[PDB]
Design a protein around this ligand. Structure first.
Ligand SMILES: N[C@@H](Cc1c[nH]c2ccccc12)C(=O)O
Ligand SMILES: N[C@@H](Cc1c[nH]c2ccccc12)C(=O)O
Ligand SMILES: N[C@@H](Cc1c[nH]c2ccccc12)C(=O)O
Ligand SMILES: N[C@@H](Cc1c[nH]c2ccccc12)C(=O)O
Ligand SMILES: N[C@@H](Cc1c[nH]c2ccccc12)C(=O)O
Ligand SMILES: N[C@@H](Cc1c[nH]c2ccccc12)C(=O)O
Ligand SMILES: N[C@@H](Cc1c[nH]c2ccccc12)C(=O)O
Ligand SMILES: N[C@@H](Cc1c[nH]c2ccccc12)C(=O)O
Ligand SMILES: N[C@@H](Cc1c[nH]c2ccccc12)C(=O)O
Ligand SMILES: N[C@@H](Cc1c[nH]c2ccccc12)C(=O)O
Ligand SMILES: [Cl-]
Ligand SMILES: [Cl-]
Ligand SMILES: [Mn+2]
Ligand SMILES: [Mn+2]
Lengths: 462, 462, 462, 462
């Protein structure tokens, strides 16, 4: 109750049985070894899953089917995928201003990228569930059990806060569903009006230190927008946009509890993970025979897999063959995360081998993860130039092969933070201390994220 | 050890407070006495309000502006208001199937009423917040403090559950936002497809015991639908519908904590209650000098006031003057609930007097509240025939005066419950015991709610 | 001195001839004997053809391609063909009011048939070229060479006017192009507004002597229309309609001079007759080895063949094989004209036999040609009841076979003439003398044509 | 008949009386002196007018009302007017290829100008009636009676052909209506598809000698077009365009016979000149008290007046006050034709005085008429550079005053003629002899016309 700053929730007082085959397949998948799982008691986990099994889902199957159709276009070279948001959402910052700000920042980039790509952009936020992270060490630099995101434990640097708390599963859901509600309301009610979003971009050009550099493209966009009105098709489709929800599928207690069975109205019933529209499997959890990859094989959602510098062409093909066994364009995204100094050399053989299979994956560039270093001032950071250069090298790789550079996956925020070095604002090592607010990796701030969109539109325009 | 789990709350950020001048005005309004308020401690109420003041809102201002525009159209005789859902929502029934069924039931009625009215229907659900009710006595038949709805206490007949627990404010918010999220998802992704909804209507006609009576009208609607395809009309606006959220604004700790200031872009900034799109004030809390009416004066949302058989023309005029001071059509809805045997006599003088003010209110009929009685078998119930008859009389009143019968307000569910007597299923006093599931008043079940829509369509066509 | 004026022609440019290979094929086809051809001199015919070969066409190939696609839909049971207009157009009646009235009459029928059929209506006018007819005898009751239509000779009962004058080919072209221009203007600028057309229908119901009989259906259509507005459907496709031009391809000097080659962009280049969108071959010129059928084989336009009571199943199959060699659905329409007393007997074996070919033709009912008789008062007339009854029987035939009753072909005008007996106006033999204006067969007047549409809508609904 | 190469047309065998006031006003207007009229016999003129009074009109009133609404937008600074086509249409070149070519050339310019202006372009062809011209001398340089266009006499240099022949009035109508039919068919059936038209422009850029100069803008346009598809509004409005018909209202026998009275459905009945959508009064016929200006005051069509170098600010205001007496934006266009060496000096005082009246005229630049000279090789010609420079000076005039440069009026053709000197093809005095085909003034060829559009788009983009 209020006295204890808690909400009391019944468990008992129920659930339809899965078709026998899905039950068998789901059980087999979750029996496999699973890295990076929280270490809380099984009985407490079960009680929380029982609560999540009967909540209203964050997403619904027909939206995920629509998303799959739109990603199929990306895979075929007829659309571009933009995925972005916080490295780690926090319960504390899950507020209207912060959510609106991140949605705005993604929409601003999307305008620029839609124009530069000359094709639709599929817009996927890291939001409404990006509450869990993996760690390479279980003890961090202060001697505390590592923070693993708010679905698992607390960011505060004290031991009690770092204990793995299963009640955070139900907390992740409440925060996710509330954020998703707002994302839906904002995108349908005026925040995603193309004209309004573009006006924000014009303001950026007017006030940025390198605005002169981006002015010409910004004017071209503006004239492109006015052309639509001139031609008498400035219609309803300019007033709204679809922003999909994504996160890393990390905590299997959470993902399994958010599974729901489709109606079967279209095709036979399948399992959908309704905690999001699409999810990805990270570098530390992509064991080929592990539980995450197997869980991904059982769900109908579009999925991605992060591929780092030790990836081989052969293992990549094995991911394709296990995760896209029916050859459905768009079902699988392969994220490229090699570091800017390595992408030009490591990616081509992977791409060639995968293309030779006849499957159509989306090739997406994750510039930021492979380019993180430590500042002299003691902050985890990334240089803007390295981020840009990885996306550049990724484009060059695809141009040379004739394949489709399908999208990017970035960590950004609508906040004016000081987390990544460089950009037109020339964020320095000493600037970092001003507003270093991320609960995990360093994000592009709103200006740097928009600037990146401008630079990438130029790579698109070639 | 017992079967609940405590979910920890806290984690407040500091968001800036509402402006001083509007808080000054708000404090003056809430100094007025409030009936029917929970009896929990102020310091606890304050702490929970503080939580709610920083959460993502359930609705956003531009939606409410848009609803106000649609309601202006109703007030002018150019659209029809349909408002419906559970008497009392409960936390344990706030599930995907129950929410989906209720949205479905409302949509089914809306197809038939749209055709029958030959004009747009504004679709407002009682949902995502109808978690509080008044009571007449503080002591129920079992010797317990009364159930006041899940925002205040628990339905279970035990003392501990019946204590007023302000942590339920936060639980109510979580449940509301989760439900609204789902309502948004369903209505934008296919549940609200006109063709799908109408197929469900065709199945009702094929299987209802009185199908034969509704067949002609249903075939005519079907032919209306096919005519649209035959004329090649751009059919996107047939794929989705807007369902707004409403509830009784009862618990002022909740409503006041959900107050937000709109951004400057939309014609300056005003106070909206973002716990819903529209709210109404009930019979027991509409004291002209009380805090509920004062609260309604201060917010920009459209509002309604329930008007029972003790209402006088003069008091009605006073509502108009306090609540529509700027003569904005549709800002105020007066909801008539006089009982079928009294409506034809009591309503006309109220209408004439209000019409003479020069203001344009929406006249909405609530035919279920004034027609409740006790079955021999001991269940609170309502006879279907009396519900229909009150709507009939409501229409007669307006026809005779040349005023617009503007809408209905009903309690319904998509479940096949046995709560109201009659309908084509001829539910008897004996049947009531089968599925009497309501946590408060008896609801029209899914078949009865649809049947009523057919009967009201014929009143609209006459 | 007499009251005509000579308008000089000549002024040929040199446009390149049609390709040699297609001219070679065309010359071979037109070496076949042609019935019912004007008897003017070849050198004069050649000079006028030469004029026509370089004029701007009445229609263009992409319109005819689009009509063919719409006719494919009719052939497949997913649309309905309505074809109607004057029996014989005349040069002196080719005025704005008469053309507007005829377009109006056709549109009025089309609203009612679109609603009744619950599917698109392809609207084809007999207009902009129906300037030629056959005759049985070369000598009429007045001892003169027969009137053959204004493309060949004059209606006036005098010898000089009755001589076959090839300058009328050019006059026919000028009149056709002027009429088509007006049909295009009217249908794109407001005459073909669904709401306006339906208002005219409401006025007919309010004033017809049998209005009461049609009131229910008309109100239902009205409510169908308002439902579209109520559902907020994008209403641009309600503002205009397509009316195609058709006539009997009779005068081969005219049809051959109006042949054009389509440009390369639309799937290679073929021969179209650009004097109209679709043409049909009449009873007297459908010799299987004659030039009319051969001409129809060579052109890409959709074509029709009239089928009277002497038709055999086997001959019908031969039309199918000569005229639909590539099995393109809707390319061929077979138009039944068997008389109401014979249709139920004679049509079924033709249909079964044609259906068994595997080809998809449009089955269209011409209910006026086989039901003509002579009034005591000395006027060629038709009884409305017999016209309706032939359509009735046509529908019965198709229902019994499970085939698609595809359309109707009627002779109508928007004028209030007195040419056919019966209808709600109960036109009598005596009334015929009031306004018997047709230059050939008796037409349904505007009221009768609309009444028929209502009756045929009820056949479609049954 | 054919023998005489003539079509014989009845006159007798009728016309509703005008409202008394329109009759009076029309009579008063035509009783005023009229310059530049043909000198044929009054009785023969009358017979031809009698024929034209009952033909199907070239345009219909609702189209002219729509055009007036679109021109109102131009006048208000929210659209741009492009008007263009042959200096003089000829009966001999009134062919499909020539009409399609001129329509194409206008559409190509319009794409470029729509993009450059960032607003809609109203597209008005000089077509379907531009068959009459004024002359300063009645005897030309060969001693023959001057050619005055094909509605009056024959271009051929012999005396008999130069006689004024009233039958040409009926000939102008037949040619006009046929051309209009084709313009309608082309613009509604695929020729005016934005994507197709723009593809022609890309081909021009690829093959023009100065294509490199226009490449950047052409690519920007292309990306603007693809942006519309990317945003999911590449809709129906991109598939067609409206091309309006215009000519100089010169021959009053023709214009008066093409007058028709509106239905009065919208407003009281007015006279519309249905020989075109809009007409203008030239320099030699704009006598303030003459019949042309007075005729223009009686018709409801939008009208223009050409203003040459002797115009004064005071007389311009008098044209505005007589021709736009009700202050209807768009009703009146003032065409600027001062020569490139004079426009910067003569236009500003005219514009200032007219703006001071509070009326909103469209200011349109006619670059070509004021910049004609004689080549050494003996051809009437114009230098491209002078044409461009007049439009430049016109823009500078309006920029300096803050007024709207509303449009251009040019003489062009889709043919590859050699009539105007210069352009990227660098047409020289000796080149002129290659394809000097105009029946009157020298036209921009297809390439020069498109090039001008590019240069003007840059003036628009400023
Ligand atoms: N994000 C805050 C506020 C909050 C409390 N309960 C919630 C339920 C749903 C959404 C947000 C909240 C928290 O989790 O403490
Ligand atoms: N709905 C389109 C266009 C659009 C509207 N708002 C946007 C914001 C950003 C980018 C595109 C848009 C899309 O999503 O592509
Ligand atoms: N959530 C269950 C699986 C499950 C059982 N029944 C279901 C119905 C629908 C979706 C999932 C399920 C688990 O973790 O094992
Ligand atoms: N409605 C159930 C389940 C639940 C728990 N927490 C929630 C948060 C949001 C929505 C639903 C829930 C309850 O309130 O006990
Ligand atoms: N969007 C329209 C049509 C519509 C779509 N789905 C519906 C369901 C019920 C009624 C109408 C509709 C409306 O809300 O009126
Ligand atoms: N239809 C009339 C009037 C007319 C003369 N020439 C025309 C040319 C086109 C249209 C109509 C006409 C006729 O043919 O005598
Ligand atoms: N364009 C649609 C609807 C329509 C517009 N005007 C009409 C007149 C009659 C019938 C239908 C229509 C059609 O042709 O079907
Ligand atoms: N333009 C040519 C061809 C032609 C003859 N008669 C016509 C009638 C209408 C249109 C064109 C023509 C001419 O006037 O000689
Ligand atoms: N219909 C729009 C767009 C358009 C279609 N085709 C065109 C050709 C040229 C210019 C514009 C267009 C317009 O007329 O503006
Ligand atoms: N054309 C006639 C005027 C006229 C008489 N009746 C009309 C009816 C409609 C339009 C014009 C008229 C003239 O030249 O004097
Ligand atoms: Cl199970
Ligand atoms: Cl008159
Ligand atoms: Mn209730
Ligand atoms: Mn006939």
């Amino acid at each position: 109750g209020a006295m204890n700053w808690t909400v009391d929730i019944p468990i008992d007082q129920s659930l339809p049985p899965l078709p026998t085959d899905l039950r068998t397949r789901l059980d087999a998948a979750l029996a496999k070894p699973a890295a990076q799982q929280p270490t809380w008691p099984a009985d407490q986990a079960l009680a929380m899953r029982t609560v999540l099994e009967s909540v209203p889902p964050v997403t619904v199957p027909s939206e995920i089917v629509r998303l799959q159709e739109q990603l199929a276009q990306v895979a075929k070279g007829e659309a571009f995928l933009l995925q972005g948001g916080d490295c780690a959402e926090t319960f504390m910052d899950n507020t209207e201003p912060h959510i609106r700000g991140n949605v705005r920042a993604l929409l601003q980039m999307a305008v620029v990228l839609t124009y530069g790509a000359s094709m639709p952009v599929v817009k996927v936020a890291r939001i409404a569930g990006q509450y869990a992270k993996p760690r390479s060490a279980d003890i961090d630099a202060l001697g505390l059990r590592s923070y693993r995101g708010d679905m698992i434990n607390g960011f505060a640097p004290d031991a009690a806060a770092r204990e793995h708390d299963p009640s955070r599963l139900v907390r992740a859901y409440a925060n996710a569903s509330a954020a998703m509600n707002l994302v839906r309301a904002l995108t349908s009610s005026g925040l995603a009006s193309l004209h309004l979003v573009h006006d924000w971009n014009r303001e950026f050009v007017r006030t940025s230190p390198a605005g002169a550099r981006y002015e010409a493209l910004a004017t071209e966009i503006d004239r492109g927008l006015r052309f639509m009105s001139a031609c008498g098709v400035a219609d309803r489709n300019l007033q709204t946009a679809e922003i999909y929800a994504s996160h890393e599928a990390l905590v299997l207690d959470y993902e399994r509890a958010m599974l729901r069975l489709s109606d079967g109205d279209d095709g036979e019933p399948q399992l959908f993970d309704l905690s999001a529209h699409t999810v990805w499997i990270g570098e530390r959890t992509r064991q080929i025979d592990g539980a995450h990859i197997a869980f991904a094989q059982v769900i109908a959602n579009p999925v991605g897999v992060k591929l780092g510098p030790n990836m081989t062409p052969e293992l990549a093909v094995e991911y394709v063959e296990r995760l896209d066994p029916h050859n459905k364009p768009g079902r699988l995204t392969l994220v490229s995360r090699m570091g800017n100094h390595k992408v030009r050399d490591l990616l081509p053989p992977i791409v060639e081998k995968v293309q030779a299979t006849g499957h159509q994956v989306i090739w997406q560039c994750d510039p930021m993860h492979g380019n993180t270093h430590e500042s002299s001032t003691g902050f985890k950071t990334r240089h803007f130039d390295r981020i840009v250069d990885e996306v550049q090298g990724f484009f060059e790789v695809h141009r040379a092969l004739g394949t489709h550079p399908g999208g990017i996956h970035v960590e950004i925020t609508g906040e004016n933070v000081t987390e990544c070095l460089g950009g037109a604002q020339d964020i320095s090592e000493t600037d970092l201390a001003g507003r270093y607010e991320t609960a995990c990796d360093p994000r592009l701030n709103t200006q740097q994220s928009l600037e990146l969109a401008f630079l990438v539109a130029e790579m698109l325009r070639d």
